[PDB]
Design a protein around this ligand. Sequence first.
Ligand SMILES: Nc1nc2c(ncn2[C@@H]2O[C@H](COP(=O)(O)OP(=O)(O)O)[C@@H](O)[C@H]2O)c(=O)[nH]1
Ligand SMILES: [Mg+2]
Length: 166
Amino acid sequence: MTEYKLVVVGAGGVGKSALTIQLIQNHFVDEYDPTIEDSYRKQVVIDGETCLLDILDTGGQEEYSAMRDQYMRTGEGFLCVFAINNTKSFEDIHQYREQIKRVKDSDDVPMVLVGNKCDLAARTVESRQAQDLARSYGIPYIETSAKTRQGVEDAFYTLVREIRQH
Ligand SMILES: Nc1nc2c(ncn2[C@@H]2O[C@H](COP(=O)(O)OP(=O)(O)O)[C@@H](O)[C@H]2O)c(=O)[nH]1
Ligand SMILES: [Mg+2]
């Protein structure tokens, strides 16, 4: 069976844990210990192929847990997440991508830019701004809501399809 190693990165509070929990357990949590950093597994069929997702939900920043470094170096694809109502988290994306390019020593790394919390009103980051950023990196942009489930499967499965074109 094919395994796909995915890593979820982004500023604190954007919904990295919520997105992962939604994919894994199909439920939305209003509060998830921001310190909890762990890996989750899920068996799913994507385009007729049964595979196992090995997902690392990264926690704190400016820190390198023995596990994060491992997934960061062995990770096959990255979900770079920001929130639609958090301009700083969007501006922060540049830092996460520069970091990933450094670890892989490459500018061709499977990656998907995710704009989360699309269920919230009065967004401060327009879809167009994110689309422009994703285009500049040569990767897809997908909006999601860990609360309503909108785009969640699409974000993770598209990341798998990016790894496949690699
Ligand atoms: N309305 C809304 N709240 C969300 C969404 N995703 C996450 N949250 C909330 O945002 C806060 C931070 O989410 P969390 O998953 O802990 O963020 P992380 O720090 O990136 O892991 C929590 O209070 C969540 O309930 C979403 O899509 N919509
Ligand atoms: Mg978290």
